[PDB]
Amino acid sequence: SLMKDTDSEEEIREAFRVFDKDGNGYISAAELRHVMTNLGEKLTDEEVDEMIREADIDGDGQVNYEEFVQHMTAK
Ligand SMILES: [Ca+2]
Ligand SMILES: [Ca+2]
């Protein structure tokens, strides 16, 4: 991976609804773990927790829309 072609926030809206499996508008550690396994990668409790605290801007433990966008587009 050199560069992902990030197509505005609209591509991130579609990405957000995959990564949120329950449809509440917050990505928890259970959801990010599940969707990583659906991508083919098996991530453990500790590794997903590292990615949740990495993506979550406010430190509540659940990654809503703005928190997911800022992390996705800058990374
Ligand atoms: Ca959710
Ligand atoms: Ca949060």
Side-chain angles (χ1 to χ4, degrees), residues 14 17 21 26 29 33-35 47 52 56 66 68:
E14 174 179 59
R17 57 91 182 239
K21 284 267 65 64
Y26 288 101
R33 184 188 186 146
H34 197 86
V35 180
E47 296 177 290
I52 292 298
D56 204 63
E66 43 251 87
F68 190 64

Side-chain angles (χ1 to χ4, degrees), residues 56 58 60 62 67:
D56 204 63
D58 55 37
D60 57 21
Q62 321 188 35
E67 292 190 286

Side-chain angles (χ1 to χ4, degrees), residues 15-56:
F16 185 73
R17 57 91 182 239
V18 205
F19 278 99
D20 198 311
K21 284 267 65 64
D22 55 51
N24 74 326
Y26 288 101
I27 304 170
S28 306
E31 301 180 81
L32 184 68
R33 184 188 186 146
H34 197 86
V35 180
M36 286 304 172
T37 310
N38 283 29
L39 299 173
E41 314 178 72
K42 295 84 188 180
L43 224 66
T44 57
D45 307 77
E46 285 66 60
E47 296 177 290
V48 182
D49 189 80
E50 299 298 279
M51 296 197 64
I52 292 298
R53 68 198 198 123
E54 189 193 73
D56 204 63

Side-chain angles (χ1 to χ4, degrees), residues 59-73:
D60 57 21
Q62 321 188 35
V63 188
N64 47 267
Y65 177 70
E66 43 251 87
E67 292 190 286
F68 190 64
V69 174
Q70 291 305 329
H71 194 62
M72 280 282 279
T73 55

